[PDB]
Amino acid sequence: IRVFAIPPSFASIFLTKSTKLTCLVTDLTTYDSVTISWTRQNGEAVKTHTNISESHPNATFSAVGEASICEDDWNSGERFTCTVTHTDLPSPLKQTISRPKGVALHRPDVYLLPPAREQLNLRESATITCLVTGFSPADVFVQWMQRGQPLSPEKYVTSAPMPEPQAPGRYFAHSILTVSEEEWNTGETYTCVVAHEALPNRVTERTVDKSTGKPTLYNVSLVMSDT
Amino acid sequence: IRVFAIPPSFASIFLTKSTKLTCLVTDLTTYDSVTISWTRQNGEAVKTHTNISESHPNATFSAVGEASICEDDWNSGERFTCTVTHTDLPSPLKQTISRPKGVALHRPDVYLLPPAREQLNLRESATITCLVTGFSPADVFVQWMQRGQPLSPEKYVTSAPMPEPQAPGRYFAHSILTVSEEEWNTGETYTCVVAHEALPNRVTERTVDKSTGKPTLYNVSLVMS
Amino acid sequence: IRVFAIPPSFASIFLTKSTKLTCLVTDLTTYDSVTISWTRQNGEAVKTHTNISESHPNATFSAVGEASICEDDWNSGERFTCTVTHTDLPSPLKQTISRPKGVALHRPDVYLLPPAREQLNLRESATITCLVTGFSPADVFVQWMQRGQPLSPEKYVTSAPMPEPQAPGRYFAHSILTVSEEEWNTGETYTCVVAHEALPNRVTERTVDKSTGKPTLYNVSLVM
Amino acid sequence: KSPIFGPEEVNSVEGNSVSITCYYPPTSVNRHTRKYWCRQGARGGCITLISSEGYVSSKYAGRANLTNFPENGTFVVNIAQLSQDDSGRYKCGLGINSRGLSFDVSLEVSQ
Ligand SMILES: *[C@@H]1O[C@H](CO)[C@@H](O)[C@H](O)[C@H]1NC(C)=O
Numbered sequence: 001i002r003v004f005a006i007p008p009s010f011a012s013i014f015l016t017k018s019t020k021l022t023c024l025v026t027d028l029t030t031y032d033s034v035t036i037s038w039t040r041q042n043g044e045a046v047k048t049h050t051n052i053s054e055s056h057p058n059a060t061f062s063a064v065g066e067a068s069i070c071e072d073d074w075n076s077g078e079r080f081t082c083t084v085t086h087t088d089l090p091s092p093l094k095q096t097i098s099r100p101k102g103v104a105l106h107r108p109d110v111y112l113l114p115p116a117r118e119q120l121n122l123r124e125s126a127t128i129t130c131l132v133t134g135f136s137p138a139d140v141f142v143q144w145m146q147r148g149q150p151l152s153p154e155k156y157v158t159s160a161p162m163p164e165p166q167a168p169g170r171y172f173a174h175s176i177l178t179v180s181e182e183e184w185n186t187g188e189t190y191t192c193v194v195a196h197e198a199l200p201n202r203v204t205e206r207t208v209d210k211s212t213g214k215p216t217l218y219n220v221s222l223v224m225s226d227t
Numbered sequence: 228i229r230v231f232a233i234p235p236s237f238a239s240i241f242l243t244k245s246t247k248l249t250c251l252v253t254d255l256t257t258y259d260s261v262t263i264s265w266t267r268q269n270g271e272a273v274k275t276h277t278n279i280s281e282s283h284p285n286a287t288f289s290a291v292g293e294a295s296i297c298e299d300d301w302n303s304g305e306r307f308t309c310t311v312t313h314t315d316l317p318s319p320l321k322q323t324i325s326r327p328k329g330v331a332l333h334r335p336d337v338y339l340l341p342p343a344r345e346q347l348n349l350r351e352s353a354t355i356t357c358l359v360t361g362f363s364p365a366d367v368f369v370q371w372m373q374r375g376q377p378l379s380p381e382k383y384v385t386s387a388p389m390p391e392p393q394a395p396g397r398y399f400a401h402s403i404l405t406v407s408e409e410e411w412n413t414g415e416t417y418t419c420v421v422a423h424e425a426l427p428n429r430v431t432e433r434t435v436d437k438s439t440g441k442p443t444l445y446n447v448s449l450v451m452s
Numbered sequence: 453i454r455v456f457a458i459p460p461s462f463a464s465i466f467l468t469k470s471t472k473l474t475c476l477v478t479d480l481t482t483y484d485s486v487t488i489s490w491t492r493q494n495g496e497a498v499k500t501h502t503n504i505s506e507s508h509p510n511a512t513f514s515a516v517g518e519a520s521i522c523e524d525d526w527n528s529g530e531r532f533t534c535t536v537t538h539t540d541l542p543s544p545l546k547q548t549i550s551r552p553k554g555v556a557l558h559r560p561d562v563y564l565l566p567p568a569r570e571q572l573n574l575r576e577s578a579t580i581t582c583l584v585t586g587f588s589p590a591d592v593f594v595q596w597m598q599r600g601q602p603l604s605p606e607k608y609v610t611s612a613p614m615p616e617p618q619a620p621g622r623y624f625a626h627s628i629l630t631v632s633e634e635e636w637n638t639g640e641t642y643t644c645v646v647a648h649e650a651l652p653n654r655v656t657e658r659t660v661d662k663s664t665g666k667p668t669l670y671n672v673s674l675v676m
Numbered sequence: 677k678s679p680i681f682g683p684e685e686v687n688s689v690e691g692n693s694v695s696i697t698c699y700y701p702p703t704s705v706n707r708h709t710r711k712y713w714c715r716q717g718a719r720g721g722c723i724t725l726i727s728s729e730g731y732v733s734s735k736y737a738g739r740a741n742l743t744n745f746p747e748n749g750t751f752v753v754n755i756a757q758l759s760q761d762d763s764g765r766y767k768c769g770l771g772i773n774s775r776g777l778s779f780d781v782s783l784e785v786s787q
């Protein structure tokens with residue numbers, strides 16, 4: 001008999017522009033007269049949360065309420081309370097939440113790497129890779145745009161952040177995008193927008209044309225003779 | 228006795244992250260006990276603002292009112308009404324502003340132009356020029372960063388959004404940045420972020436080094452005997 | 453009761469070479485048979501100020517006073533006064549305007565920048581920017597010619613002279629021109645002329661075509 | 677000369693299916709090296725429509741499979757749902773697209 005509340009993540013405040021916070025309840029049966037509430041620090045009102053989940057088969061129920069909030073005021077560290085009182089638990093409980101102030105705020109430095117020349121040889125497919133290194137804390141959010149409008153998420157694959165071993169407790173990530181190869185030899189700018197909560201304007205954007213690795217000079221020297 | 232309701236410009240919501248709208252009252256009679264405030268469409272209160280105006284240098288009185296709102300409250304469709312209370316007012320004045328939704332939206336196409344070779348021959352200073360174009364409405368913002376740490380606003384000069392010649396209601400701008408000639412011939416990536424309320428993440432950026440082009444040079448050398 | 457004076461600047465002279473200076477009368481009630489005059493320092497008379505305009509349907513005042521002068525009486529320092537008498541203010545009003553000497557003059561460096569490869573690789577339309585940097589005083593006249601034939605002024609757009617960031621009392625301006633890039637693939641002439649007062653002959657022309665800053669690639673060095 | 681050998685001329689009506697076998701000298705490189713079927717377009721080169729490693733292009737997705745019988749010494753390309761954009765000039769081959777080792781099939785669809 002427990003309650004799990006999920007805080008708003010930066011890969012969701014940035015993706016959906018609608019900072020909000022949920023409250024699911026584990027190991028409580030599928031009964032009526034549910035208490036799900038969201039209060040500020042001072043306990044004032046909140047958004048009307050609906051779309052309660054379905055009755056699970058094993059006699060458990062998670063009444064999920066989604067409530068929004070002004071944008072700064074989540075980051076200012078205002079505590080919220082998910083208060084619960086079911087039938088089996090007529091005694092309440094307040095699952096409290098806050099913004100974790102603390103840990104240092106370093107910013108990513110994003111290098112976008114173009115496909116290997118051994119790969120654009122089979123003339124099959126090019127894997128462009130965005131290497132979001134050096135940052136802290138977690139929750140980077142990488143997405144890809146071609147010429148201005150963002151691509152499908154079916155085509156790129158972001159890893160979850162992994163901690164970097166040479167440097168201290170600062171993560172990295174990476175994200176590959178696999179394009180066709182005839183689409184790449186045409187041109188095709190293909191940029192990598194990387195959202196973090198420690199950048200100046202929150203978003204970095206790097207890009208790769210076809211012409212970005214290409215050598216500065218070819219320097220042949222042919223010595224045909226007869227000796 | 229003229230009350231304007233200053234709408235928050237987008238170039239200030241982006242520069243300050245702290246959208247403030249201001250009731251500006253001019254030519255009030257020379258007195259005191261001034262009562263000014265900002266309300267929503269539902270008339271709900273905002274805090275009292277600090278930093279009141281001084282008396283006119285033209286022998287009269289004026290008022291400034293600084294209310295910081297959530298951005299979703301201002302853009303969500305809520306009109307905003309100011310109240311001003313003075314001596315010569317028989318009744319207060321409620322001045323209304325709404326975010327003018329109903330303009331077509333288009334996005335800037337920032338092409339960052341690099342300095343002319345005629346200029347890096349006088350050995351003095353380059354001007355890199357960030358041609359923001361194609362966009363609508365006004366209220367672009369352009370600022371310049373060098374390795375993710377922005378230059379001071381004394382070095383770049385943004386223009387004003389002037390209407391584009393050939394296209395319909397749309398605009399452009401420029402922004403020049405003048406950098407001395409040994410800076411640019413070292414590397415020095417010089418990016419140009421452009422902040423506009425019709426972009427996806429509200430910010431795009433482009434960049435230009437010394438070598439942003441300068442193509443393949445073939446250098447054949449035949450010693451055919 | 454305001455009387456303004458709109459003078460002719462370098463853009464207004466050089467487009468026309470027929471300097472006409474205008475005395476604007478505003479902020480009264482709507483009376484007819486207005487009495488205005490354009491006089492010199494020595495009290496003489498000029499061309500008549502015909503083409504009176506309409507009044508204002510928002511009930512402000514509208515009267516213009518023009519006079520065609522030729523240039524040397526405008527540069528040598530003759531003050532030109534518009535005199536105003538009417539029924540609301542029947543006292544003689546003097547609005548004096550001249551050319552305010554006592555300012556420097558530096559020469560505009562002009563650089564004509566060709567369209568960027570990000571813009572052309574869409575193949576929609578290119579814009580060429582003439583950059584008129586470094587100069588002082590203001591009032592420059594930028595216009596564009598396509599091989600000795602002046603383009604239509606619905607096509608280019610000149611800026612206004614905004615003061616330079618790191619240069620002390622100088623200025624700059626810009627002027628963009630939108631060429632259809634299909635015309636830039638033939639890449640004809642596109643010259644930018646810039647009329648200032650501090651040039652030697654007062655007109656500088658720069659030009660850019662499709663192959664201007666293109667460096668040499670194919671350095672074939674055969675040796676024997 | 678390149679030792680692959682396919683069908684030089686293939687004819688099949690729209691909607692019907694094609695089976696195109698191409699043979700190779702059954703070495704131990706040629707059994708295991710990459711086998712392609714590229715579309716020699718105009719203005720340049722092969723654009724690999726269906727490789728044998730497992731790429732299958734945007735066009736031929738759902739309608740083509742390339743299999744490989746290395747003991748029989750051949751590889752076979754099945755293409756269903758023809759249309760008249762499936763007409764033109766194709767190559768069946770091995771290894772890299774550029775370096776020859778190929779054969780030139782001329783696919784020609786009829787109404
Ligand atoms: C180009 O080739 C010439 C002759 O082979 C050589 O002397 C020169 O150094 C080369 N230029 C470079 C490396 O920039």
Ligand SMILES: *[C@@H]1O[C@H](CO)[C@@H](O)[C@H](O)[C@H]1NC(C)=O
Binds near residue numbers: 444446671673
């Ligand atoms: C071009 O080739 C000449 C011929 O020797 C060589 O001296 C020179 O370095 C080359 N120039 C460039 C810019 O590569």
